[PDB]
Structure formats: C-alpha cells, structure tokens
Amino acid sequence: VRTIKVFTTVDNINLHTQVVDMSMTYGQQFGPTYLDGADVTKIKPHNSHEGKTFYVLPNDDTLRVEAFEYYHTTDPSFLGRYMSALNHTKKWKYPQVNGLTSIKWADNNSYLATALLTLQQIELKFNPPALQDAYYRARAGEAANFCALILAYCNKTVGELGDVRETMSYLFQHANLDSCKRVLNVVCKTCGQQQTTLKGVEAVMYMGTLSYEQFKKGVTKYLVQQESPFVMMSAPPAQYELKHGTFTCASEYTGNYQCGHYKHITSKETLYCIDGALLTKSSEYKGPITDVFYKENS
C-alpha cells in the first residue's frame, strides 16, 4: 500500500498530520478536500502532494471548533465558498500602487480593489482571527486570501457585481466598533431635550451626503456629536469636487451603458486616483463620487 503524509486543516493554523492511501481519492478519505483553493476531492494523491497542507470541511467536533474559533461563523457553507473564491483570487495580480496593495482588474473586481485600498487607510480591528490575519497579510502585499474571505463573508461569488459601501458595511459588522458613538440632538423650540445615540457600526456610516462638514453642521434639524476613528459617507453618484486634504479617500463610480466601474481616490501630498493597476496624480479631482471616507486621527 503506497502512502504519503499530508496535513489537513480548516484554519491553516492547526495542522493535522494524515496518512493518505494513494489508491483512493481525497474525497474517499477526507470528504471534500482543497489544495490552495482547488477542489481535489476527486483526485488521487500525487507524490508532489507529500507534506502539503489541504483544507477539509469541518466534519468532526475538533475541526468544527477550530473553524468557529477562526472564522466566527457557524455557516457550514463558509469554508467551501471561501475555497471557491480563493481558487480565483490567488490568480489575480496585486500590484503595489502609491504604497498600497491594489488589484489588477479581473472578474468584475473593481469594487473589491476599491474596498481593499480603503481598508488599508482606516483603523479596523476585526473580530474573526481569519480576517485580522489576512488583513495584515494583505497590507503587506499578500491579499489573495483577504479578498477570498471578503467574498465569503459578504456572500458574494467571484464575478458577481459588488458595491463598495455594502462591502465596507458588512466588514464593519465583523469589527470591534463598540466604542464608536454618534449622538443626535433635536434642534426645536418647544420639544425639550430630545437625543438619540448610535453606538457601534451605525455610528461610522451615513447615507445621504458626501460632505462631513455638512453632516456635522446639521441634518427636522439635528446637532451631531461624532466619536469614531473614521466615518463613511455615501450618496448617489454625482459630479463632486474632491479637495486635497479635506478627506482621506473616496470611491468614484461610473455607470456608462449600465456597465459599472469603480475607481479609488486617495488624498496624500496630492490627489491620487488608483484604478486597479493604474495610477493617476492630479491637484484637483471632479468626478461621480459615491463614498467619501474621513479619518479622525485621534
């Protein structure tokens, strides 16, 4: 009986040595099995596979606990959707553009590149170790796994049309924002003190206008107190002037002929427009902006 030793895992942190019979498929021995995202369930082991790490579905209590501790989801479909995405995202190119990890365009991923760029410019503490780990890898240039996880957590497949604001929101719902706060106070003549407080993720997002200045001035009429490391402001795509130094980064969205495309604008020493692998510098920017992000900087 020919055999090799492989490692199985659900988290790539805890590795479980296995002895595999080379005359049977991985599926026969492990159930659904993946090698770097590729479905090798129906494949017989190769000698090149010796010593390699394979992902498996959490079929026992031990693996189920390891998966829950790493991903913080009980969805039994997660790992398979994660692997399905990783098989694609591993083949994407991740150029460094103006000091940030971006993604060369493929598979309708402009929204993911724009989200990835934004995530590198705001302070976020992810709760699932899987996201915290891959976040720090992506920030160092190895972003394939992070992108595959974003797709899995957002319940989106490679190639599906995506929205930066949505993606950011759903990632925020996997972060520790417990200390973020927005207090709204009613401006009235005869209604007394009327106040409501948004804590957590609701505090870091707003829909209706792009301008933080207008929002802080007031929004029937409300005085606002904002306490968060960042805020995401979104509005319908509209021609909008981005002035250097007045924002951290922004999403541009065009919908010519109903085929959308995102670009990312970041404010450094001047305005940089990152469009996947492409980089364009300018002193002024006017375009159809739909998200603007602002950083508190303590």
Ligand X SMILES: COc1ccc2cc(C(=O)[C@@H]3CCCN(C4CCCC4)C3)ccc2c1
- Sign of the dihedral defined by the CA atoms of residues 94, 95, 97, 101, in that order: positive
Counting contacts by CB under 6 A, is residue 38 touching ligand X? no
Of these, 14, 222, 260, 296, which contacts ligand X (CB under 6 A)? 260
| Residue (73 or 209) nearer to ligand X, CB | 209
Per DSSP bridges, beta strands 205-207 and 230-242 are parallel
Of these, 219, 237, 277, 295, which contacts ligand X (CB under 6 A)? 237
For the bound state, the minimum distance from the C-beta of residue 73 to ligand X, rounded and expressed in Å, comes to 24
Site string for ligand X, 202-231 (x = CB under 6 A): -----xx-----------------------
Residue 256: both structure tokens together? 């010519």
Site string for ligand X, 158-177 (x = CB under 6 A): ---xxx-x------------
For the bound state, the minimum distance from the C-beta of residue 234 to ligand X, rounded and expressed in Å, comes to 4
- Residue 3's nearest CA partner among 63, 62, 46 is 46
Counting contacts by CB under 6 A, is residue 288 touching ligand X? no
For the bound state, the minimum distance from the C-beta of residue 101 to ligand X, rounded and expressed in Å, comes to 22
Name the closest residue to ligand X (Cβ): 207
Counting contacts by CB under 6 A, is residue 290 touching ligand X? yes
Cα pseudo-dihedral 144, 149, 154, 157, rounded to 10 = 60
Residue 151: both structure tokens together? 């797709």
How large is the angle between the packed helices 144-153 and 129-139, nearest 10 degrees?
140
For the bound state, the minimum distance from the C-beta of residue 237 to ligand X, rounded and expressed in Å, comes to 5
Contact residues for 221 (Cβ-Cβ < 8 A; gap 6+): 186, 187, 188
Residue 237 neighbours by CB distance under 10 Å: 17
> What are the residues binding ligand X (CB under 6 A)?
161-163, 165, 207-208, 234-237, 253, 260, 290
